[PDB]
Paper text:
Here, a high-throughput approach to determine room-temperature damage-free structures with excellent sample and time efficiency is demonstrated, allowing complexes to be characterized rapidly and without prohibitive sample requirements. We also examine the challenging case of detecting nitrite binding to copper nitrite reductase from Achromobacter cycloclastes, where the ligand displaces a water molecule bound in the active site. Our results cover several different ligand-binding scenarios, such as coordinate-bond formation to a heme iron (imidazole) or copper (nitrite) and noncoordinate ligand binding in a pocket (DHP ligands), with the latter being highly relevant to the binding of ligands to pharmacologically important proteins such as cytochromes P450.
The overall structure of the enzyme homodimer was highly similar to that of ferric DtpAa crystallized in a condition that did not contain imidazole. c difference maps indicated that an imidazole ligand was coordinated via an N atom to the distal position of the heme iron in one monomer of the DtpAa dimer with full occupancy. A second imidazole molecule is bound to the protein away from the heme pocket, forming a 2.7 Å bond to Thr351 and interacting via a bridging water with Glu283. The imidazole ligand provided a more challenging case owing to its smaller size in comparison to DCP and 5BR and because of the lower symmetry space group (P21) of the DtpAa crystals. For the latter reason, the merging statistics deteriorated more rapidly than for DHP.
Numbering used by the authors:
A (entry chain A), B (entry chain B): 55 to 416
Write the structure that this text describes.
Amino acid sequence: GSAVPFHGAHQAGIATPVQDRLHFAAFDVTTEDRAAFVALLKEWTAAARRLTAGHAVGEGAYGGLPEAPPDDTGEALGLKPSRLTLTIGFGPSLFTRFGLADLRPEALADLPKFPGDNLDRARSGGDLCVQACADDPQVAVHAIRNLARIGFGKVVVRWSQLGFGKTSSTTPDKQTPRNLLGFKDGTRNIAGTEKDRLDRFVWAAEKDGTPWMTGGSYLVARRIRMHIETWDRASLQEQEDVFGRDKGEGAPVGKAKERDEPFLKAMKPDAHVRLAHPDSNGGATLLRRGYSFTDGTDGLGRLDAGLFFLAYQRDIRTGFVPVQRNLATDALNEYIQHVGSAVFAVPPGVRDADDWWGSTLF
Amino acid sequence: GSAVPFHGAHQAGIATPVQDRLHFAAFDVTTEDRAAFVALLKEWTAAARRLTAGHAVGEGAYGGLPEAPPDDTGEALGLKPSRLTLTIGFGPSLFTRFGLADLRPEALADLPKFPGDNLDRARSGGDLCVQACADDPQVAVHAIRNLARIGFGKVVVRWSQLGFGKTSSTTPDKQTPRNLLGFKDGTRNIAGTEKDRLDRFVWAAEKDGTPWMTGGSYLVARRIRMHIETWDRASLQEQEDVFGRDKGEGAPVGKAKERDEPFLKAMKPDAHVRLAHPDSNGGATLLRRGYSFTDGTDGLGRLDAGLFFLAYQRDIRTGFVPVQRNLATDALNEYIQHVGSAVFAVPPGVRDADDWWGSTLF
Ligand code: HEM
Ligand code: HEM
């Protein structure tokens, strides 16, 4: 129920412990007025300060003038902060506006086409994103809804994704959640307490070449459908062979405990963990922070299910891209398909009550 | 509270405490063989006993023959029962199979077309339903997913709806939840503690005309989309006039506290509470047990959210039908649209370990 501090050198919602629920929204910018967009960013930052503390935006949800719409839509009244974090990011397409072309970070790289990609352009891309994570889904939806309302006429929601449950962990002292394939997901990630690994693999540094991004990160989002019917037909041995870990304990093959270190040579050459491991990718390491989703049925008699994959890294070119390239032969590919994609530059944190989202860029 | 007893004179999930999350699935039957369908009901009931106790179905999720698919898909391993209830219901279309046409209860009435209906046929109807309620959405999804898997070849999933109410870890039990219009939702309802009211308004009685339904109930499901962005542009006074209660406290107009009894005469004539109140409907009273939903963003950039309405009643003709008919002029109609509908006969409870879902019918 507690609040997560909004201010810091970094935005919350990255190294923060992973909350139960996600509402991810991608926005496109509809205004050409740089000043009006900067004003929006300040208004959004002010609202985010209220929302993450459990307060209503503006002058509140009721008690104002009867003839005016309330400033806050009111469905979070009486609710605790619920560890709400709000994380903003800027997509490549933003930098074609407002005279920003020369400020696009080199580390904000467009993703190549990958084998098997079946990307829906409507559920991909976006000028900017807001990742809302909280333990209460109503608190998360309330935040996105009120940011979008405040932004009416300056931004429109391009697409959004809800995650009903996490499939990641930044807290290895807590139980690792399972994805909808039934495997623990998050065992060998970067923990929020591992400051040295966050500096090396997650946070952008001044010497990296883009000063306004110092203290920020780069986000890759991949909407991944799972072929549940095919998976659920597979034998237990086939499933464990796909990953290189056993299903029950989640230990590396041959070992007894989840957090025992993998011995990669004991795994099949196309095992997911073997191909995605840093040792197999020149040391490339990611902070995974994804969530599960199900968006109804496929219309053909089956549940739809997937994983909304989110990875934070210091440089997309040295994080997601090499690892995903190495997954070209992944045995998992038989059971999944990437159907949505987006990359964002996540700016540094809001330092204090005078600062605002994107101040280092604008 | 950890688990909710599965066995009883009534199915759990109706009068039992309302859990934080919903996964509602409608199934269509694909087999013509009555014996095969009875076998499935027995297998499902065995699975449900395991699931509601927090155990895996069948021989488990791991540790079986390596060359065999696991009996349980495994994504609920390590989770608690989370107050899971599983409630099955039979739709009108089921009674066109297996020679059951003369056993369809008269109280399982087809709903008339209502003004403003915009029903998606693909998200309506269904031969069967399973209402999975729990505090952990992964527990509920795992239940539906495994029931669907066990039934593969005999049933398919027609449509599926995830929903949420309050988050109990952070929200007191005595506090009324708010719907996504920001108003308290549930103040004047039948509570599961009111045994006499349940006997009068909710449970089917032997003398009602269908003996196999004694101790059962009748369920109406309506997927009601809210026009969120239009609602949020309405003035505070307009919103309160729509309902006849104030937004902050939820008290009836002219009264001071949420639970003060309404003075209907002081509300506008087409106020929602005034039109839906039992005194306006010849005494008709419902057990409302619905959930909020938010499924994402639609093609126009609007929030796909609303109320997944669920009502239980002794007879659809004397519960939902008269009340919904009286909402023909509801001021709320400007802001909502009914887009899915289904009705189900919910059979009596599973009395003991040898009983099975549907045994009184088959
Ligand atoms: C539906 C899609 C996916 C599923 C079900 C899945 C599942 C898993 C599982 C079960 C593990 C072992 C437990 C763990 O350490 O977290 C794992 C590890 C990992 N995955 Fe995935 N994964 C998926 C997609 C991806 C993608 C797209 C990437 C990167 C492009 C990725 C990168 C990693 C990494 C880096 C590890 C840790 C390997 C290590 O250092 O030991 N995964 N994944
Ligand atoms: C999105 C759609 C709806 C919304 C937002 C909504 C909202 C509300 C609100 C705020 C209340 C007052 C608090 C309460 O007692 O729960 C209420 C009461 C009620 N509503 Fe609705 N409602 C909706 C649809 C319906 C429908 C479809 C029905 C029946 C067909 C219905 C029947 C009732 C009843 C019986 C009451 C209690 C009236 C009383 O006895 O005081 N509602 N509703």
